[PDB]
Each structure stands twice: as C-alpha cells, then as structure tokens.
Amino acid sequence: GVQVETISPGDGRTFPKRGQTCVVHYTGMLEDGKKFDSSRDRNKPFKFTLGKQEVIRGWEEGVAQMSVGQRAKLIISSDYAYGATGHPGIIPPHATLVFDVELLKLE
Template sequence: SLTDGRKFDSSRDRDKAFRFKLGKQEVIRGWEEGVGQMSVGQRAKLICSPDYAYGNKGHPGIIPPNATLIFDVELLSLE
C-alpha cells in the first residue's frame, strides 16, 4: 500500500501467491533485500523508500513518483 493507506495490489485479494526468483531483477530492490532475509513461514512488513521501490518515476497510473511503499509479506516456500 501507499503511505496514505491506498492499496495498489494484493496477491491475497487474488488468492494466488506471488512467485518470483531472487537475484533476477524481477522485483523491486526492497523485495530483493527484504525477502532475501526471511525464513519460510515468516511474515514481515517491508517499508520501501523510493530508492528501494520505483524511484522518482513511480509506475504510471499505479504508483506516484517518489512513493514510499508498505508491503505485508509472507514467505510461503522456497525452491
């Protein structure tokens, strides 16, 4: 979510886990570093400053420029 509480995406709402590979630049830097330190079954709040998220460009139509993002993340499995 954004710092004002607006939700921009939720894999929980879709009832489908978000899958990605660490180290492949598939996700923002905040996820690479935050999820990379988690253990299976752990839940964490990741607060990503713009330089660890989408920076000064944002993601047009979804995330404004220079946005700090807050994620509620649960690591379900590792492969």
C-alpha cells in the first residue's frame, strides 16, 4: 503493498493503534479512475477497528500509517486487496484500488 500520499496534512502526532476504532470518509476508485464506492455518498462515516481484520490489508496498513485529521490517497495492489477473486459485480478480478481517505477521529 500500500502506498500513501498525503493530500492534506494532519496533526502529525496522533496515530491509530491496534484495537482502536477509526472513523473515516472514503471514496474508492479503480486504477482506471472509475468510482465504485464512497462513504460520503451515504453521508455516514465508516468506522472500523484495527487488528480485527474487518477491512483488507491495504486499509489496515494505510490507515495505520495515517494520522488523525489527515486526508490521503491510498494505492492498494491486488494482493493487498480482494485480489484474484475480486468482488463479483463491483471490483474486476486482479484490480488495483485507489482510495481518497480522510481520518476524522479515533474512538
């Protein structure tokens, strides 16, 4: 894998820790640029707990790298994502995913 590029800076001090809930807004696009998912569209932040394997490896590591209040672009390879199987109907097999992720707060 996962590559992180800081779109906007964060506090730079608070970072997610294992077993700590992370609240984010994400917009997911395929490497071609086609959008397939976005929490801003649903208007509800996505909350997930690190270390529980609730999200894929790319989210795990990339969001662990990000700091509170930071907006970043995450590039996640197929191996670090749904991979060969993919997500039938949404993500084509063997696809790289690009996510615009803002880490709102930690709870």
